[PDB]
Design a protein around this ligand. Structure first.
Ligand SMILES: [K+]
Ligand SMILES: [K+]
Ligand SMILES: [K+]
Ligand SMILES: [K+]
Ligand SMILES: [K+]
Ligand SMILES: [K+]
Ligand SMILES: [K+]
Ligand SMILES: [K+]
Ligand SMILES: [K+]
Ligand SMILES: [K+]
Ligand SMILES: [K+]
Ligand SMILES: [K+]
Ligand SMILES: [K+]
Ligand SMILES: [K+]
Ligand SMILES: [K+]
Ligand SMILES: [K+]
Ligand SMILES: [K+]
Ligand SMILES: [K+]
Ligand SMILES: [K+]
Ligand SMILES: [K+]
Ligand SMILES: [K+]
Ligand SMILES: [K+]
Ligand SMILES: [K+]
Ligand SMILES: [K+]
Ligand SMILES: [K+]
Ligand SMILES: [K+]
Ligand SMILES: [K+]
Ligand SMILES: [K+]
Ligand SMILES: [K+]
Ligand SMILES: [K+]
Ligand SMILES: [K+]
Ligand SMILES: [K+]
Ligand SMILES: [K+]
Ligand SMILES: [K+]
Ligand SMILES: [K+]
Ligand SMILES: [K+]
Ligand SMILES: [K+]
Ligand SMILES: [K+]
Ligand SMILES: [K+]
Ligand SMILES: [K+]
Ligand SMILES: [K+]
Ligand SMILES: [K+]
Ligand SMILES: [K+]
Ligand SMILES: [K+]
Ligand SMILES: [K+]
Ligand SMILES: [K+]
Ligand SMILES: [K+]
Ligand SMILES: [K+]
Ligand SMILES: [K+]
Ligand SMILES: [K+]
Ligand SMILES: [K+]
Ligand SMILES: [K+]
Ligand SMILES: [K+]
Ligand SMILES: [K+]
Ligand SMILES: [K+]
Ligand SMILES: [K+]
Ligand SMILES: [K+]
Ligand SMILES: [K+]
Ligand SMILES: [K+]
Ligand SMILES: [K+]
Ligand SMILES: [K+]
Ligand SMILES: [K+]
Ligand SMILES: [K+]
Ligand SMILES: [Mg+2]
Ligand SMILES: [Mg+2]
Ligand SMILES: [Mg+2]
Ligand SMILES: [Mg+2]
Ligand SMILES: [Mg+2]
Ligand SMILES: [Mg+2]
Ligand SMILES: [Mg+2]
Ligand SMILES: [Mg+2]
Ligand SMILES: [Mg+2]
Ligand SMILES: [Mg+2]
Ligand SMILES: [Mg+2]
Ligand SMILES: [Mg+2]
Ligand SMILES: [Mg+2]
Ligand SMILES: [Mg+2]
Ligand SMILES: [Mg+2]
Ligand SMILES: [Mg+2]
Ligand SMILES: [Mg+2]
Ligand SMILES: [Mg+2]
Ligand SMILES: [Mg+2]
Ligand SMILES: [Mg+2]
Ligand SMILES: [Mg+2]
Ligand SMILES: [Mg+2]
Ligand SMILES: [Mg+2]
Ligand SMILES: [Mg+2]
Ligand SMILES: [Mg+2]
Ligand SMILES: [Mg+2]
Ligand SMILES: [Mg+2]
Ligand SMILES: [Mg+2]
Ligand SMILES: [Mg+2]
Ligand SMILES: [Mg+2]
Ligand SMILES: [Mg+2]
Ligand SMILES: [Mg+2]
Ligand SMILES: [Mg+2]
Ligand SMILES: [Mg+2]
Ligand SMILES: [Mg+2]
Ligand SMILES: [Mg+2]
Lengths: 200, 153, 56
RNA sequence: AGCGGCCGCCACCA
RNA sequence: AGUUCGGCCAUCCUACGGCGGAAACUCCUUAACUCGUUCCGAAUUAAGAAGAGAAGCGCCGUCAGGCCCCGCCAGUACUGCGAUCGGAGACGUCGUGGGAACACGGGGUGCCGAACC
RNA sequence: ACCCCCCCCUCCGGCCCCGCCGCCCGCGCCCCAGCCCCGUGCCCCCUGCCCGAGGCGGCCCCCGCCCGGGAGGACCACCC
RNA sequence: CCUGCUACACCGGACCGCAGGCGUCCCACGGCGGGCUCAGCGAGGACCCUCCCGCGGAGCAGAAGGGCACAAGCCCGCCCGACCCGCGCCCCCCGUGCCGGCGCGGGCCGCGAAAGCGGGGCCUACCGAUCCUUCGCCGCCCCGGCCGCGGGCGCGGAGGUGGCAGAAAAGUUACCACAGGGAUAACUGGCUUGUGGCCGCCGAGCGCCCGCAGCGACGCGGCUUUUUGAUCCUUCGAUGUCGGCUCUUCCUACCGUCCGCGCGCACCGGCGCGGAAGCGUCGGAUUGUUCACCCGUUCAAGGGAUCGUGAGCUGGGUUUAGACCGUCGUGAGACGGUUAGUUUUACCCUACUGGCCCCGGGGCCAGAGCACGGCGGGCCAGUACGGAGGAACGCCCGCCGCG
RNA sequence: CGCGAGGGCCGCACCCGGCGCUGGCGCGACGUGAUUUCUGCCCAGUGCCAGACCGUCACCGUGAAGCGAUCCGCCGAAGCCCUGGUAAACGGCGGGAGUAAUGACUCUCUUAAGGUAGCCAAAUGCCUCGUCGGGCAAUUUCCGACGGCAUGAAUGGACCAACGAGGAUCCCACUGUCCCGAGCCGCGCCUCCGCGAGCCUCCAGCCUCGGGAACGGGCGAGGGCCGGCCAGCGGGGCAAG
RNA sequence: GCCCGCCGCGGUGCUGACGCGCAGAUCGCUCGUCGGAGCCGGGCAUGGGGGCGAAAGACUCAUCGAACCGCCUGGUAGCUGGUUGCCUCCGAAAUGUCUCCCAGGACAGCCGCCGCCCGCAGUUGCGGCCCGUAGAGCGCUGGCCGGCGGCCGCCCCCCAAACUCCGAAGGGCCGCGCCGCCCCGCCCUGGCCUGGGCGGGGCGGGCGAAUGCGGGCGGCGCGUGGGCCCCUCCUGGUAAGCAGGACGGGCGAGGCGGGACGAUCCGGACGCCGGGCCAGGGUGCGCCGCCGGGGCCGGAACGGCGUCGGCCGCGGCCGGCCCGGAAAAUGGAGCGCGCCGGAGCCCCGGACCCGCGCCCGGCCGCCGCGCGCGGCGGGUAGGAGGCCGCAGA
């Protein structure tokens, strides 16, 4: 029911989203983008890992769903369902067309019908991210390895200096918490206000 | 193209500038114009009478007629191997006085002024395209020592 | 059969071969299109100037 | 466009 | 300092607290006449001087929102010209020119012109 | 290793030996090692430029059919 | 004809490119002046009313984009610039026409205290030559004169050409044509590889247990040109266009036989992998068939060579002219089935197969050619192995195919 | 189906002709195609026909007006229109829902009428090598049944003894069709004496790969090769016509 | 209008012979019919859009879905073929608009020739105005994952050809010599003693970026209106040696060397010679030309305790060059032979080989010239000048 994925690998067309001009698009395969334990506080999971793209290409939503299930299932075995939070970074927003052979007209009136969706990714862009505690730190790179075999091309697995899905480094974050100057949201941490009406 | 009406392809050039909508200020009507003057054409998109075609936006011409309500402007226009002198009639909201010869009148006034002053020898009044620098000394008592840095990734 | 529809490939080179011409010097001063009420007063003024008048 | 009472019959150089 | 008429149209706007008034502007008092309100003297038109700094207006304030300037962001993103440079390609590199934005941190918060008191 | 190469087997330019019975041409020999390489890292360098035996290696030349039969056969050829 | 995008910041820029629109509608839905402020949130009020804030989030005939707040929107008053006479420019563009717009000189008007504004409906689309006909001014001519009818002419509108720079126009040919075209289809070949076919990588799972003996979802990466498409480069003064028969040679992506390893391999029999293209892969029933489907045997792989092979054949199919049926057509006729229908020429050149251009007897060998596979029986042995069943190295004896 | 002669059908430039030396048991125009057994429903459409003068529909003629040209009225043949008839004229001849695995049954929308008697995967059935049965070791063929892409009644339906250089399947007998080929005869071929042409021809005539108008005898690179001829042969010369 | 069968009359099958024939339809065997709607001979009748037809569009003297003969007629063709001596000077287009236009034309462009007349630029610099693309972003019109706190507020992952508050590179248009100061004359516009336009005088001045270089106007006319390729930038399509657009360049219409081989790639653009220098590519032998020095030893995902070199702490990540992944049909191609501490790959340095391409010298022709000499030379379609040869007056 699908062409082999080599038929839509590279970014050759201008982006073509579903809109009031494009209609009849089938539903993508991936619909959950935040798995694991997303409601855990910012202070719980200080470790973060990524899977950076090594190519400028297109990833299908069928492949995004395969890589989500591979990674998630592996960690939920070695470490339990609540030691990690896994986020899929890229979203499938681009529509690919097909000019369907069967009377048969060939290249006359060859503008094709919607057939699928793909995500448009660039060099060094993250595709998956994980934040976890220390009890899972050993097995995250094993689950990222699983996902890599579902994605076309060359991918790189790296460990970040940031604190979780926050924006400070661990040493930076530690000190800011050490003196007080750092705000807390739910699972994200910000800085002192220092602007606007004093209190009331 | 496949469709070529008078105001085709005008979605951005005829639109107003951000927070610059509404009526034109009244300097548009208190300026004095004279025969032979240079002007710029810029279309104001809120005034629809005597509004020139999009080709003429951003050109510079010369006044040939002073009418009761509109001005007559001459534009040199290239057509496929020759230049044509075109004449158009445009209302005041689309014309502004041009400074294309402003620099030349300042210099002509400045050369006759600096001649009157004579500095007993007359100074050189030709414009000079920037020359190579002359010889000079510079101190190196306090000198900084830089070098390439290591890759960080 | 089908043939080519359009190109401008060689046209800027043909446009340049004889130079880009310029309009006649006298087109810049043509009276065509000037106000008639200005062109009437222009004739009247000269006809009554002995230095300019050309009446016999 | 023409007679008759939407129907008939008949007309026809930008 | 004030009023009438203007230029440029927020460094002038919006919100909330204040402080002021000799003169000036305002609020304010009136329904005979003038003229007026899909009904209404609210508005507006006419006629006035008992009362006011409560408003509008002028001034001051605020880790105020906006707006305006500078620095950083950054010789980074991108790009003109040249290459028998690399790579299966997708893309990147070097030589020679041009060069951002967002974000971020500090500063600021109408002036010019005619006539009259 | 049913594969591949050689033998056996089919064709076969050329050549050699033997039967019958002359010409011409050239002048130069250790071997074996390269992480023993046994004392090296040379000689030759005039094919006429003044060279021109014997031995040792080369070269040339040398051999009918017709006719009739057949185990042979289009014609020829082949075997007698 | 028109809007936005394609289009890569002057202008310009292609496609049977993308999302759409137009052949109308309105004496007010028009002109002018004055007044007013919209959509709505919030908060109130017997079972629409009020205040407050309100950059337009409303409205402006109908596509889309742009424009507009004491207004270009709404309401009221008075009106007909939705006029007459004469010129010029802009867009498209050859700087020709047409649609559409804009700027002026002179008449006559509308509204307004006045300055002003007004040649429709805010701007970008909403439309039409010559000849003829018809109507409206103010005049001139009817040529030998004059008068009355009538006819013609100078100017301007209307009646229409949408295939919109504007002929007056139905089919069929299987009875056939002519000039040409590889500028252009039906068949080989070429580029491509979606589709077909073949091969990897990962490891959710299955497999009593046990992811990898054998398997392997979701996904991802390739190769091939034995399918079918896509395209139109070569061939239309012609490359004979299906299959079968006959005959030869080649590929390996290997079905049986050979040699090694592995097993969820006791034996027997199966299965998986590597090397290997020498030999073998057959006889028939129905079909033109390639394909398929059954019966039988020593149990039976897949392909290429101009979809190998028509001056080698055959001519069943398809594929002229006769004829029949069904559906369709007013008709001549058209298209799923059916039957009858001429297969021409080598003596040239090369290739190939043999043969020749007279030269003793016996030999040697450079080059070239090439050929022994497969299936059984007896003994081993009813033994090893394990109850039922049931092998092997070796030697010897036959058969089949080929030579 | 038309016509009783003063007619009908046809010829023909004109005058004049054929059927006709004829007369309804005749002449002319069409369809079906011996016999046997049959030939159902529809006149709304198209075609044809006869009976009525409603509307329309010519010139001529006639009235009113005009200087006259002319303008407007009235009059009104056939035809059409209207009223009927006609299918062995052309042609046409059904949907949905339930109801004892079927549906006698019922309600329903509908036509000018809704295919009757019969026949059938037919020389007419797409699906399709239909299903079942016969026959064979084995049958996309054949025969017999069953019931419709798109069977069917002088578009003639069904059946038929005799007849056919007509299209099919099977059996006995017969055989070189074949397994699988072998031997022989005459005449050509072949050699010789005599005689003696046609077609065709840029120039030439050995291969492999590359590139190239994408399949070369010639061009780039490699591998072969004295030269001259015969009997045969059909791979190539994109052989000839 | 019965059956077997001879002559006769016909023509079934062999898809036999022949098929450069015996023959522009024949021959062999086999076969239909043979008392009848049977076969044969002579005379006579019907004539071309007509005849005649047991009906095949058959036959009408080898001619028939309209005979033959002469003329109209050398019928018309936007279509195929051909179109005849030399040298010299110049030199294109395959595009816009309209067309019963789409294999054709007219008008414009491009080019030639003939002229005639008295500053300039396909460039940089300096100055003034214009644009909404790449990038960036989520305020606007839309789209989209989640987390905290009381429908609402703060954070947050990810987006747009028909979103844009910001905004390049890059382009585009205009200007760069005559100015000042007082007066005087003429006539629509103003309250006026106002303005504005066109002219006259008297005065002071004065050549105000770089670089190169002579410029402008007309007449008459032809060929062309199928293009294609490269580099960058794009659109449809799985893709294509596919189809459609853009600035600049090329082939067309460009010789020579090199890329083994090719219309277009790398160099270089051309009269006839002699000498020199050398671009691009290369330098074991074919085949003109090489040495020295430092290292190493077609194709995807994915694997490698092959070898050499790194970075971060036995381990983990990498780089160079190699190995596996890597299957086609006649015998065959890193050009061949061959090489492999090279005759291979990367880098450094000194040479060498040769395109009349550049330099110097001579000669030819053309265009110029202080008349001393100087610069130049390709060419399809097309145009112009000077001549060679033929027959006759
Ligand atoms: K991967
Ligand atoms: K233009
Ligand atoms: K106050
Ligand atoms: K062999
Ligand atoms: K042997
Ligand atoms: K033009
Ligand atoms: K228009
Ligand atoms: K006017
Ligand atoms: K007309
Ligand atoms: K008229
Ligand atoms: K022809
Ligand atoms: K053609
Ligand atoms: K062609
Ligand atoms: K072509
Ligand atoms: K391929
Ligand atoms: K073709
Ligand atoms: K083709
Ligand atoms: K052809
Ligand atoms: K040919
Ligand atoms: K095998
Ligand atoms: K026959
Ligand atoms: K045997
Ligand atoms: K045998
Ligand atoms: K045998
Ligand atoms: K009948
Ligand atoms: K009959
Ligand atoms: K009957
Ligand atoms: K009827
Ligand atoms: K009837
Ligand atoms: K009827
Ligand atoms: K029936
Ligand atoms: K049957
Ligand atoms: K029927
Ligand atoms: K009988
Ligand atoms: K018969
Ligand atoms: K018969
Ligand atoms: K028969
Ligand atoms: K024989
Ligand atoms: K090739
Ligand atoms: K070839
Ligand atoms: K050839
Ligand atoms: K060939
Ligand atoms: K007979
Ligand atoms: K024979
Ligand atoms: K015969
Ligand atoms: K008989
Ligand atoms: K006749
Ligand atoms: K005829
Ligand atoms: K004739
Ligand atoms: K003739
Ligand atoms: K004649
Ligand atoms: K013609
Ligand atoms: K023709
Ligand atoms: K010809
Ligand atoms: K036509
Ligand atoms: K054309
Ligand atoms: K044509
Ligand atoms: K022309
Ligand atoms: K947004
Ligand atoms: K496609
Ligand atoms: K050129
Ligand atoms: K390595
Ligand atoms: K080669
Ligand atoms: Mg695309
Ligand atoms: Mg020019
Ligand atoms: Mg308008
Ligand atoms: Mg037209
Ligand atoms: Mg026929
Ligand atoms: Mg072609
Ligand atoms: Mg494929
Ligand atoms: Mg073609
Ligand atoms: Mg042929
Ligand atoms: Mg052939
Ligand atoms: Mg074939
Ligand atoms: Mg052949
Ligand atoms: Mg043949
Ligand atoms: Mg036929
Ligand atoms: Mg041998
Ligand atoms: Mg019949
Ligand atoms: Mg009947
Ligand atoms: Mg029938
Ligand atoms: Mg035998
Ligand atoms: Mg040839
Ligand atoms: Mg050669
Ligand atoms: Mg041959
Ligand atoms: Mg008989
Ligand atoms: Mg008989
Ligand atoms: Mg025959
Ligand atoms: Mg003729
Ligand atoms: Mg002729
Ligand atoms: Mg030239
Ligand atoms: Mg063209
Ligand atoms: Mg026309
Ligand atoms: Mg026309
Ligand atoms: Mg092409
Ligand atoms: Mg050409
Ligand atoms: Mg060469
Ligand atoms: Mg050499
Ligand atoms: Mg020349």
């Amino acid at each position: 029911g699908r062409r082999p994925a080599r038929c839509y690998r590279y970014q050759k067309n201008k982006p073509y989203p579903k809109s009031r001009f494009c209609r009849g698009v089938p539903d993508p395969k991936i619909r959950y983008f935040d798995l694991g334990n997303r409601r855990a506080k910012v202070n719980d999971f200080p470790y973060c890992f990524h899977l950076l793209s090594g190519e400028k290409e297109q990833v299908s939503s069928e492949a995004l769903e395969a890589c989500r299930i591979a990674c998630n299932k592996y960690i939920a075995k070695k470490a339990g369902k609540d030691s990690f939070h896994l986020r899929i970074r890229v979203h499938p927003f681009h529509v690919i067309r097909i000019n369907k052979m069967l009377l048969q007209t060939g290249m006359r009136g060859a503008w094709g019908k919607p057939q699928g969706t793909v995500a448009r990714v660039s060099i060094g862009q993250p595709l998956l991210s994980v934040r976890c505690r220390a009890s899972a730190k050993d097995y995250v790179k094993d689950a990222l390895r699983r996902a890599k075999f579902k994605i076309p091309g060359r991918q790189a697995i790296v460990e970040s200096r940031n604190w979780g899905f926050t924006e400070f480094t661990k040493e930076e974050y530690e000190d800011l918490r050490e003196r007080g100057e750092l705000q807390y949201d739910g699972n994200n941490a910000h800085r002192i206000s220092r602007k606007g009406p004093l209190n009331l | 193209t496949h469709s070529q009406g008078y105001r085709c392809k005008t979605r951005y050039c005829f639109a107003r500038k951000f927070r610059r909508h509404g009526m034109a200020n009244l300097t548009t009507y208190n300026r004095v114009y004279k025969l032979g003057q240079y002007v710029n054409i810029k279309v104001n998109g809120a005034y629809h009478k005597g509004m020139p075609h999009r080709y003429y936006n951003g050109r510079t011409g010369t006044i040939f007629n002073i009418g009761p309500r509109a001005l007559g402007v001459q534009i040199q226009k290239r057509v496929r191997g020759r230049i044509m002198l075109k004449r158009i009639n445009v209302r005041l909201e689309h014309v502004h006085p041009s400074d294309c010869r402003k620099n030349h009148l300042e210099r002509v006034a400045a050369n006759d002024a600096a001649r009157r002053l004579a500095g007993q020898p007359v100074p050189c009044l030709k414009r000079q395209n920037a020359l190579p620098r002359a010889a000079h000394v510079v101190s190196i008592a306090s000198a900084i020592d830089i070098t390439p840095l290591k890759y960080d990734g | 059969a089908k043939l080519k529809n359009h190109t401008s490939k060689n046209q800027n080179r043909k446009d340049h071969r004889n130079g880009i011409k310029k309009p006649k010097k006298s087109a810049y001063t043509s009276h065509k299109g000037m106000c008639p009420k200005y062109l009437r007063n222009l004739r009247r003024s000269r006809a009554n100037d002995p230095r300019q008048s050309l009446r016999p």
